[PDB]
RNA sequence: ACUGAACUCCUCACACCCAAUUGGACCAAUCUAUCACCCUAUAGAAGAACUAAUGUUAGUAUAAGUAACAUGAAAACAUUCU
């Protein structure tokens, strides 16, 4: 099982590494900007 | 016969010019948790960034040193005159 030793190939897994899993939460878009929102949920 | 453009070719480098709406990836600053020690990495947040709403608080221009405004005269400030 190469997993544990492959992990041993790095420094100590400190608190600086606990990443949310990619696909954890979709981006919290503030309803604005040049791309997502110009009228923010109501239209003209 | 030329001159005449993002049409096209010419050499690089090409996924870099609609309307809403939707869908994905990055980040301005701050706080926190570990890092780090001239502005820093990665994560959880969240009152999270403005050329404007006939917005409001402070400052300050302009119109401008303009529009408008006051002390009867004289005299040693005794007093006289109008
Ligand atoms: Mg072309
Ligand atoms: Mg288009
Ligand atoms: Mg940045
Ligand atoms: Mg905000
Ligand atoms: Mg402003
Ligand atoms: Mg204003
Ligand atoms: Mg004038
Ligand atoms: Mg005058």
UniProtKB/Swiss-Prot annotation:
Ranges where the record places region Disordered: 13-44
Top-level division of the source organism's lineage: Eukaryota
Signal peptide (from-to): none
Basic residues bias: start-end ranges: 27-43
Subcellular localization(s) per the UniProt record: Mitochondrion
The protein's assembly and partners: Component of the mitochondrial large ribosomal subunit (mt-LSU). Mature mammalian 55S mitochondrial ribosomes consist of a small (28S) and a large (39S) subunit. The 28S small subunit contains a 12S ribosomal RNA (12S mt-rRNA) and 30 different proteins. The 39S large subunit contains a 16S rRNA (16S mt-rRNA), a copy of mitochondrial valine transfer RNA (mt-tRNA(Val)), which plays an integral structural role, and 52 different proteins.
Family per similarity comment: Belongs to the universal ribosomal protein uL15 family.
Protein name: Large ribosomal subunit protein uL15m
Organism for this UniProt entry: Homo sapiens (Human)
Lineage summary: Eukaryota, Metazoa, Chordata, Craniata, Vertebrata
Gene behind this protein: MRPL15
Parent-protein start and end of this portion: 10 to 53 of 296
């Amino acid at each position: 099982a190469r997993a544990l030793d492959l992990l041993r190939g790095l420094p100590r897994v400190s608190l600086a590494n606990l990443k949310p899993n990619p696909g954890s939460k979709k981006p919290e878009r503030r309803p604005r900007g040049r791309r997502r929102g110009r009228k923010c949920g109501r239209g003209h």
